[PDB]
Amino acid sequence: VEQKKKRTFRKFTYRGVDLDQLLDMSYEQLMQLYSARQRRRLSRGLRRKQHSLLKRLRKAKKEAPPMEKPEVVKTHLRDMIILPEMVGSMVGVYNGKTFNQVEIKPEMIGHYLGEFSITYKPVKHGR
């Protein structure tokens, strides 16, 4: 369960780059194009000292067949912006007290992990 033409129908550009082209560019060439939030993170970060986390992504994607999703790979970071390399993995996105498990589909690219995990209820007062 990975890449385009599969979990997508909204499609077109994220932000300037069509998902076809996106998925077959590297993150290098991605930040060059139309990307401003992502661009700041990658430039100033400079590959961003989340090294081991990213390697755990590749590891469990590899060891699992490409026909199925990983064994789930947790992270504490949720400020990670989805890059085409990641896509098709299944990411435990920490909330400081829960790991919400979210498959990263081709429609999520350029968005943040954190936006798909909640710290917050739909809010009630007995509602």
Residues found near RNA in the complex (CB under 7 A): 52-53, 55-56, 73-77, 92, 94-99, 119-121, 123-126
User: From the CB of 121, what's the least distance to RNA, in Å?
Assistant: 5
Given a contact cutoff of 8 angstroms between Cβ atoms, the answer to whether 17 and 34 are in contact is yes
**Which of 33/118 has CB closer to RNA?**
118
User: From the CB of 95, what's the least distance to RNA, in Å?
Assistant: 7
User: From the CB of 94, what's the least distance to RNA, in Å?
Assistant: 7
Phi, psi of 77 (to 5 degrees): -75, 150
